[PDB]
Design a protein around this ligand. Sequence first.
Ligand code: NA
Lengths: 178, 179
Amino acid sequence: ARRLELGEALALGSGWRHVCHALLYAPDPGMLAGRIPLRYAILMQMRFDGRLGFPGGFVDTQDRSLEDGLNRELREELGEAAAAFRVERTDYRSSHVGSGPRVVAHFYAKRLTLEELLAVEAGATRAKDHGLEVLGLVRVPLYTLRDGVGGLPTFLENSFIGSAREQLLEALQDLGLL
Amino acid sequence: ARRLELGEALALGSGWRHVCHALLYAPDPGMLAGRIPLRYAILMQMRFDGRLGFPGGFVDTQDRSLEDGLNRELREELGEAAAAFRVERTDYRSSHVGSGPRVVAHFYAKRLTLEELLAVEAGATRAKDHGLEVLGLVRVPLYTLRDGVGGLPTFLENSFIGSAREQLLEALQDLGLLQ
Ligand code: NA
């Protein structure tokens, strides 16, 4: 893996492919078992290959920016509820270049209202990709249970796509969660 | 784990707790990328502990039977659309001594129409447990991708509760859901 400057990434040869994924989240006041604060509702997706990842996809020649790519792809995966907002350049977090495929993976985090995020959750089964490219959404448990293993640490033992695990860890550190 | 016949499992006494789970599935003629047959939609659930399991829960004092407990629990976990069908004794598959102090886990498999199963998925975010006890539904991918790893093999590498993994595989074999 290799962190790359955005300007650097945009200037990569025409050969390279770009993908954009977004962490959609909202403040959540709720309490699991009336005891353990949820803190935030964060969405991930089980992909057709059995790995957990974030919603998004490939930027294509038809797209004029990373962001039009992302939002276009977001609407496929999540359905019309995703068109209630737009992930923009101001939501951008990172670009990562692995080895293997010539792909740069850009990460975005978009804060929403709990209402908005819930509506995205509730409509995702009517999205184009549901039951095909996408197997279903999950929430990320931000809490660690009393045994120190259940909740977030066990969630992180699941199989993840690409940099999604790294991308999530980083975004939680930046939210003051650990 | 140690399989018990249903009559013996039921004969366990007083301090033993009973938990009931259902594999809900439906035929699906969909083709991934126009070429990989889905065969069936099968539901599992990301639990509050980050583990994948099947929907259901604990039978309580007020339930008349295992089946009443299971259907009640499914209504709580999945929401209203779970009440379009009823999981019966005919759907029962197995009982095992679970991981947990004195717990027997009963397992059921229930075939639905696709319409019924889509409706369980569509309503699931409004259920009582959603966002709390449960974190979200996912379909079990039954195919293996060209690389020989993506799909079912990789899915089987996720974190599972109790013996959910083993209940899935057995059910996949006995119900003839793979090729
Ligand atoms: Na419950």
